[PDB]
Every structure is written in structure tokens, then in C-alpha cells.
């Protein structure tokens, strides 16, 4: 298991391509019927930043939960005493790209709980192994992970 390099993404294709996470289906807003498809992840082994104080970071698709929960296990196995951390889940802040998978609960930005940047390349490798459809070492401060839409699986 080798860490991802800075700015590396796996698989080595664009996020929205068929081999990776696939196309953006459309923004999910709070006042929408599709908002009801999102449920909060309440995993005790995951830290949610929730700087918004809204619980938005917990909201994600079922497939996102499944891969994130597997990742929570491997993180603790890799570094005893450390946990998976989520800085961004579903987003309504507009704090991502124009057509971000965050806007429909298909992406998370993650760190370790100790916010040790030196662990993030390996964290990214763990996210690949946990089954995320696309993983990108997007900034010095976080790893972006995403999944296929529910109706693509």
C-alpha cells in the first residue's frame, strides 16, 4: 500500500468519467425532494468538523456512507488512537467547484483526526482500498473522495 502523491487521483481519469465517479446529476438543495435521499452518517468512529453547525457534513448517499464506514475501520487499524475526520460532506455553502459532487452528497473531504498532514497521502490510499470510486489528493489540507450515483449502481 503506497501513499498517493500530492495532486494524484485514482483511478487516473477525470472524476466525472465512467471509470471513476461518473456524471454530476444535479445540485440537491435543502428544500428539495431529493434532499430526502440523503441521511446523516452518525458513525461514532468518524469525526465530523461541522463548522457550519448544521450537520451538513454528515449528509451523504448510501454508497458514500458504505465506503466511508469501511474507511473509518482501516484508519483506526493503520494508526491506533487516530480516527477518520470529515471536513465537508454534502454542501450548501457553495464552497466547491461549480458542479461539485458535494452538492449532491456524493463526495467527502477527509483528514485524520490529529490533522497530521504527513498522513494524508496514506489516508488517500486507504480511501482507494475502502472502495471510493475516485480519490484525489486535492490540497495539502484534505483528500477528496467521491462515489458513483445510486442509480448508476
Amino acid at each position, epitope marked *: 500500500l503506497t501513499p498517493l502523491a500530492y*495532486k494524484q487521483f485514482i483511478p487516473n481519469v477525470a472524476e466525472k468519467t465512467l471509470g471513476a465517479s461518473g456524471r454530476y446529476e444535479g445540485k440537491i438543495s435543502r428544500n428539495s425532494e431529493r434532499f430526502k435521499e440523503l441521511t446523516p452518517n452518525y458513525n461514532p468512529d468518524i469525526i465530523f*468538523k461541522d*463548522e457550519e453547525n448544521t450537520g451538513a457534513d454528515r449528509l451523504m448517499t448510501q454508497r458514500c456512507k458504505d465506503k466511508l464506514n469501511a474507511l473509518a475501520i482501516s484508519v483506526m487499524n493503520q494508526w491506533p488512537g487516530v480516527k477518520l475526520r470529515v*471536513t465537508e460532506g454534502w454542501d450548501e*455553502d*457553495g*464552497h*466547491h*467547484s*461549480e458542479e461539485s459532487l458535494h452538492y449532491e452528497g456524493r463526495a467527502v473531504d477527509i*483528514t485524520t483526526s*490529529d*490533522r*497530521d498532514r504527513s498522513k494524508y497521502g496514506m489516508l488517500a490510499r486507504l480511501a482507494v482500498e475502502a472502495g471510493f470510486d475516485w480519490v484525489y489528493y486535492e*490540497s*495539502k*489540507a*484534505h483528500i477528496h473522495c467521491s462515489v458513483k450515483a445510486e442509480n448508476s449502481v
Partner: antibody
Framework: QVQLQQSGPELVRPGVSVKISCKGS????????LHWVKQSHAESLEWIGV????????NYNQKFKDKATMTVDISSSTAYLELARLTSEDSAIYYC????????????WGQGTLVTVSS | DIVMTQTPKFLLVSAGDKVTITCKAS??????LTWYQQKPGQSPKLLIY???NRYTGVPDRFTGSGYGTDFTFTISTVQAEDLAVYFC?????????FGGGTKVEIKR
């Protein structure tokens, strides 16, 4: 409402040190990194360093390693920048600025502190 | 350290005209490029990050593009309130470094 409030302008004699402060409000202070940036007019913006209140970790620009010391007081939500052995080169505006855990770039800035080095 | 060379140093523009500012890195900075706006007597304000993402609240008239070494900041139709010094900044390499600024002045 996120705010970084800096201490007022300073007149300091050459060779002496100056300590300037930056108080954060409207967010959980311990939770975000705080950076210091110098602005003159001839070298406009220069990154001095960063302190991470949550870990106590500091990283300095090598250009400022001998000059600057960054500290925090978590109980009062205040970061401090101490610049030692001041010369004319040190007269400038100094900002504190917060990152938002997306990389080393800054969403909220303090109002700046003007330091004038003079006898 | 990575040097960011920003051009032009100054622009004089009528409200409604296009503004194009260029930032060139001495070596690749991937997409780790930020643009700030600094209005007279104010602290810098974040406008664009990751080379092309508009920050929240930032008007549609402001865009960024580029990847690697060549970056462009555009105001499509400049407004009277956009008078400011604009700066690029990279954070790919350590330390983070800024361009020298472009002063946008308004003709009327």
C-alpha cells in the same frame, strides 16, 4: 461572523522586539490555523509563517526564521507574532489571516498592524 | 522559492470594459493558485481559489483560469467598485508566495 482583531500600531526603537496580537471570534479559535503576512510597498505581500492552535505546531518562512516567533493563548483566543532585533526593513503592515482547511490561502484577514521602526 | 510574475502592473479601464491580468509561476504550481482583491485601506479579500473556483458571494463578472505555470484573472465588465490592487498567490511550494500586484484604476 468570523473576525480577526489585531492590536494597534506600534512605534519601536531599532534593535528592540515587538509583539503584536490577533484575536479570533465568530468561530472555534483552536480549530483553524492562523498565518502571518507582511505587506510593505516594494515587496508587497510575504508569508511569514503559520501556527496551528490545535497541535501547537509552527512553520516559518526561512526568510523570517531568525526574526519571528509565533505563539497562541488558547484560553483568550489570541495569537501573537514577535519580531526581534528590528531594523528599517521591518517597518511594514503585518496581517494575521486564517486558512479554511482547503490549503494555505486565506478567507479571513485581520485589519493589519502598522509597525514603524524609529529612534 | 517559487516566483509569481504578475502583469500588467497597472491598468486604466472605463466601467464596462474587460480586465485581464496574468500571473506566471517560475515552475509548475498545479492548480494551487489564489486571487485576492485589495481595495484602498482594506485587507485583501479572497476571490478565486484552485485557479478557477469562485469563492462565495463573489460576482459572476470575476473568473480565473489556468493550470501549471500560466494563469489568467478576468473581470468581464469592470464596475466602479472594482478599483483595487489584485494579487495572485501560489501555495504549491513552500513557502507560499504572492505576485507583485496589479492596480486597476478607473477611467471616467
Amino acid at each position: 461572523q468570523v473576525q480577526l482583531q489585531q492590536s494597534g500600531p506600534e512605534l519601536v526603537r531599532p534593535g528592540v522586539s515587538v509583539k503584536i496580537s490577533c484575536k479570533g471570534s465568530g468561530y472555534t479559535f483552536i480549530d483553524e490555523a492562523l498565518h502571518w503576512v507582511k505587506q510593505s510597498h516594494a515587496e508587497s505581500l510575504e508569508w511569514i509563517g503559520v501556527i496551528r492552535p490545535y497541535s501547537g505546531e509552527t512553520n516559518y518562512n526561512q526568510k523570517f526564521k531568525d526574526k519571528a516567533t509565533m505563539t497562541v493563548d488558547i484560553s483568550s483566543s489570541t495569537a501573537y507574532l514577535e519580531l526581534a532585533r528590528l531594523t528599517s526593513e521591518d517597518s511594514a503592515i503585518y496581517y494575521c489571516a486564517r486558512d479554511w482547511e482547503r490549503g494555505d490561502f486565506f478567507d479571513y484577514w485581520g485589519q493589519g498592524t502598522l509597525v514603524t521602526v524609529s529612534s | 522559492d517559487i516566483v509569481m510574475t504578475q502583469t500588467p502592473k497597472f491598468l486604466l479601464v472605463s466601467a464596462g470594459d474587460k480586465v485581464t491580468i496574468t500571473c506566471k509561476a517560475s515552475q509548475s504550481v498545479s492548480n494551487d493558485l489564489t486571487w485576492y482583491q485589495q481595495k484602498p485601506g482594506q485587507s485583501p479579500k479572497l476571490l478565486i481559489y484552485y485557479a478557477s473556483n469562485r469563492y462565495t458571494g463573489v460576482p459572476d463578472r470575476f473568473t480565473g483560469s489556468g493550470y501549471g505555470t500560466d494563469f489568467t484573472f478576468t473581470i468581464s465588465t469592470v464596475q466602479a467598485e472594482d478599483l483595487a490592487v489584485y494579487f495572485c498567490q501560489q501555495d504549491y511550494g513552500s513557502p507560499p508566495t504572492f505576485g507583485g500586484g496589479t492596480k486597476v484604476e478607473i477611467k471616467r
